[PDB]
Amino acid sequence: MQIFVKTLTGKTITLEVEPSDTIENVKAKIQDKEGIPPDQQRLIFAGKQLEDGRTLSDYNIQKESTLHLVLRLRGG
Amino acid sequence: MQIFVKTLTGKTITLEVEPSDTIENVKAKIQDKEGIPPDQQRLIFAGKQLEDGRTLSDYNIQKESTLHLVLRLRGG
């Protein structure tokens, strides 16, 4: 399915994933798109935050779902 | 090349390094200049924190690059 990812900056990303896909796999796909390191990411969806390992299915995340992505608490 | 190291609120230190230079090596040059021990340093660039081992070439850090010298201390 094609899920969207809205950043806290002002941009969206259309990533093609599936239900069996692991949140970890997603974070990786993002790092390839932009350049943000996994150890520095925060995905939130209608419900709560997506933990590593689990699959997009666990969070019943369907297609066209907006994933609120936020960077770690830093400064620069 | 001559890279710059701006301190949060101290001064801008300039160190002559190269692309094959390892971050750890840089931190060493700083410890010799001032007195801050590596185990108490944190080079941040464009918001992207640099990890030890890597080289100034991995981050593409060119010459006259402004590095934000930040401190850190956590573990518990």
Add this chain to the structure above:
Amino acid sequence: DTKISSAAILGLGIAFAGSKNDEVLGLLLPIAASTDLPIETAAMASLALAHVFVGTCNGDITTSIMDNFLERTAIELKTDWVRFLALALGILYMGQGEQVDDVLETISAIEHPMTSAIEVLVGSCAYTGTG
């Protein structure tokens, strides 16, 4: 009386007032959320930027400010500054924009009913409030 502090930040605010330089920010942000040094000169700084980026809101900002209300961390100390901080998050935007609406959605998506007080502040303002 008035702490020389205000006088200091005041000068800086009028310094890089009209200068969208990614430098000042690259220094203020950290000192505002570098996860280390105290939270003293931090709070003030946070406001300094708000004044400048009062209109055009950046990302690295709402990101750190947000990752704060949640993780907070910057706990090294505590006293009274959540007032000025919350205020910024409000004026952080121009005013008329559903953008804020989304933000609130994030704060609601996550637990931590402590920031509730804030949810009522920003909420009451902008849309969803007046009648």
